């Protein structure tokens, strides 16, 4: 099932999402040159703020300064994703988003990295690292309850850039 | 893969949470036991166009309450999506106020098992079916998505089936 | 296996059908352009009076009107259908019929729409809307004991022909 | 799918619906049980050609009564098509009065265990079968559709089959 | 194994030894082709039971001839044993002269093919077929052993056939 | 389909009607328990050569009974068929008056089992087979259609049997 | 899986033999245009004693008049062949043999004529006649206690031969 | 061939021999129920790249004791080459002293199991597991060869997990 | 088909007839529960080359008897082959007085289970088996058909695997 | 799964080994031409000092004189071969070693020459004799308790060179 091996070509992918309040097509191929950080979440418009993904969000320049690219997704719609980006984040929204938001109603994307959670239709809080080349490098699946460090993605992302020039 | 929404036959059975009265509540089709069911999809969540054909079987349900009729909406978006979209004043677009169950169909398995999914999609068509109070389906409607559904020829079914189901056929 | 998918081309037909006291060879291709209801009905000669079905023939000006065709269908033959033709209205027989009457004998066709009840070798009273392009745009079955509305089925062939122009 | 007729065999077990008398009956094959049927298919109701084939066997049904012999008519036509049929009178093509029992076979089920329908238009070839006391299949005709059957050789036929199974052989 | 023999359909192939006149022949369908045909089979040469229902067919082929119909005899002995019985004189139970081909079918091809074969014992039923000019069945009859066949019945039905094949069905 | 005769294991059963003395008979091999039974097979009755091979094992029939063996011919002919050849004088090439059991095979299964059956023709090919007091197969003889059996040998071979079994080798 | 059929091509063979001392190939398709006899005994070296193959050898030469060749065959190799024909008849070996012994240690040959006696791996006393054609005209097969006759052999081939001419008498 | 461990499924079970405390030992991951395990995979002994990464794990372990956790380390070389590994001091590039089990996949079936296996060459990916007190796989993490892991990270993951195991989300 | 004969796993089980002692015998390896066992298989009776490899087991059989060691000869020959080659002087090639059983595996399952059948030949390779008293293959030695075995090494494989029995490694 | 046969081309083999203190390639294609023992032990740094491996490096002088490869394998990788050959061997080790030693932490090799304990990952005490032209001449495998002996393996490819030009 899952596609996603480490030193193999990362699932490619292609669908709509939420860019500057705005319905755009994300293709992996788009990204061909950069790093892209790939990360799930399960549910938008969940009772418990959303604040790792905020943190994607609002520390995106440094990742920008990087050269690396940050997509969000879930198995929400892309209309889903809008009216959850234009609830103000006082009131439990995403508010204003610096990233791309996919929408993967297919379950597609979720099936090929190997984070459905089958039973619910939703993803894990899965985070995944691309190279320039396109090949998957790392990979990060978290149980529901448990989020992702900007942090440590950072680490990871800095680590392979130095020893993709250095060994 | 396939659908198991056979006419004569028992309705596929579904079990799945929904948003009745701004609370989570759990859905089975054996809780209508005795009683006629309309289960109606519905595709997305926050659509920009309005959501009208959805909101007149809300305010009509009293109509299909004095016939002891359940009314049930679906779609393939969560519980959570359901409930933002249900606290979303209809002047705004939002549903507002329902007076039936939005079942969340995330897994897809009722839209499945109805046969009303759009693979490629994600998505319900705009499928109702009507279910008899011993769980046998009867009525099978399935619209591509352009095109709504009638309260009315809803109404009409319904009526008519429980009347044949005492007396056979009406000429 | 049933081969009616909403947004599928309709599952094919070609068969004999009573129309206007005559035997006709009719196929789906040959309404390539129009829009098209195909509806079936359980059984010729019962005791309960084909109203529904006198509706469509009755009304079938509407349709024309909207440069909509008509096909009834049963498990029946074309014998059937006649002799059921030739019998008045004021006898429970379909009097004149406006609209082709096809039968489908060797069952193909209710199998393609889905709509056939094995154990009976009848019909579900099952009505499908094709676009003209032979597209599958509405599904619509029926338990034997309940009837169809022309209305509703004006509603949704009028309905389709508009979004298929403006959208919504 | 596939012929279950064979000679010296048990025939073929059949349960359906038929017209009798002007009423709707049930007829089983162990009804007849210590009894010689002859059970004959026609392909359509409501026929041009007029069916002189079928309404011989009714009018000298008398002389199989007398040989203690039942008789079956049976096609792929619905019961009301054969009571519409029935109701018409032989002047103007119909059946009129039977004296036989008339079966309706819309499953094709009885049709195909006696291995005499034609596919392609889901109508039974001019097919008779003589079957014994014990339930054995002892004689198998079938026709091309164009080509009728003669009571005169059915009456041959099911007294040599009577005379030889207490005497043996003829000659 | 299982019998090939279906209405409307082309006739099982045959090509077997036979005797006619006296002499071993060849005998193929094909032969025939452009003609009606008929194919009948019987049990057993030699036996103690009168063989004057197949004599008939020989005796009475001057009216097949004369309708341009071709009539074979065949049976799972071999063509000696055929010239044996024809060499024996009808008042010792022989067949005596013979006007109509007798085909052998040892390897029981032909009784396979069109399903008369009786397993048990290596025997044909009494089965009776008749084939058209274009090689296609249009005819199927299988006795059980103790009764036997009319010529009067199967002139009626290769009459049948033929005015049937330029006219249709009439009254 | 398959034949079940094989050295050393229980010649293939057979039950099947035959003529002996001009009468309808059944024969089953069970019959012959504690018997050696010559079982031949033959291809046609009524063919145009002679059958004096045949014939050898009915005139010389003394000689097996001589040693408490039962000779049984055997062809897929019918019994009917058998008689009118056996009712047939020997000067007009019948079988004449035959001191042994003829077996009638139109099934075809005692051909089979004993794998001497010719499938395109549904005759059996000249086989022979000798089997022991204890219904063991001993030996097996098939020869094609042209060439015949002897007498002679299927003797010398019952008694080295018969020999064998008292005695053991050479 | 027996491929011996009358009426059918002989199931081919080709193996190792000692022939006149020597180790040599035997190949059916060497004896296209000939009548063979192919026979097959269970074991060298034996305590009873080989009569039944030293007969078919001793009177070989009936058999090259007609120009029939006469094959013998076990499953023992063609060294104890050799070993058994080196011993002297005297003390119960083959002596002289004017025909190939065939060495069959594959059981290929047993099992493709339908004589191998599997719990043993030996060869039933089986004897197959062969045409100038290939094609096998008799099947004779003896239980291990009983052997064959020359004469019987020598009247089958003869009349074989003379059947191929004439046809039947 | 197959990978085996699945988040909110029980984790891949396994019972190997391992270096602990300078000795062989037998560890069956159902030992541990009722506590969080971290299992983490390298690649080979004996590399001439600083192990700082696997010592970090084994110095700080005292942070892993004190939250009633264990940590496992993992790879596809033998208790024997181990063994030479941690007897071979820091300066020298060895591991030194370890506070943790070291474990022995020379069978290969963990990272098999696992779905950490390289399998051109029969060494394990950089995979770190966090198993919760009931043997359900809670966090998935495999990096690629170049790239080592995380201690604050690993230690913030599991303590996230064990607070959420009591509270829920914040 | 298939070899069933590996290391650390029970022996292929055999039974065959043996040429012993002026005999034929019946042999099993559960007669040999207790001790250990070498079997080692020769290609052919009667060859040309000398069998000084084979009579060397029989020669210095007291060294393995002394052992308490089963020593098992075996080829695809038969017992008749067996006693002839025996029966010969070895002057003249013959194997003369055979103080161990010689096997028959003229069925060759024995060689096909301890996988050393020349399939194209049906004759053994020169394969070499040490089983130890619980009836556990210890040791596969298989040899192409130009060379021969050793005594000496035999002893010293049989004699470490009894020390280690008992004694582990040195 | 074996492929090992006698009479048959040896199964091909191609990895990394330890020769002279550094990594190289080692293929069997290489030998062409010259007698190849391939022997497999089953761990590095037992506790059982590794006499009967050291035997074939401290008398290879004799198998070169006889113009024969020796080549040492287990499925241990070559870091850590590496390691225990720059152990010396009065501290258990392997010391100097005049024979290349191959690493098959694939199994690979092992699985081909049929020497694998699978339970373990580690290879049977097994010996094979490859001649000139790549042919399987001899087969040898010991259970893990008793070593091979020189002397014994010297007699085995003398024989085959012997009977090579003899027969």
Chains 1, 10 share one sequence.
Request: charged share 25%.
């Amino acid at each position: 099932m899952s596609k996603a091996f480490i030193g193999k070509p990362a699932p490619d992918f292609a669908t709509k999402a939420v860019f500057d309040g705005d319905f755009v097509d994300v293709k992996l191929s788009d990204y061909k040159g950069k790093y892209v950080v790939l990360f799930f979440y399960p549910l938008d418009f969940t009772f418990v703020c959303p604040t790792e993904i905020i943190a994607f969000s609002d520390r995106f320049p440094e990742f920008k300064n990087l050269n690396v690219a940050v997509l969000a997704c879930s198995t929400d719609s892309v209309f889903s994703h809008l009216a959850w980006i234009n609830t103000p984040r006082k009131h439990g929204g995403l508010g204003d988003m610096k990233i791309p938001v996919l929408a993967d109603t297919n379950h597609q994307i979720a099936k090929d990295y190997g984070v459905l959670k089958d039973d619910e239709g939703i993803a894990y809080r899965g985070l995944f690292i691309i190279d320039p080349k396109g090949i998957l490098r790392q990979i990060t699946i978290n149980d529901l309850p448990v989020g992702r460090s900007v942090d440590e993605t950072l680490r990871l992302v800095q680590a392979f850039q130095y020893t993709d020039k250095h060994g």
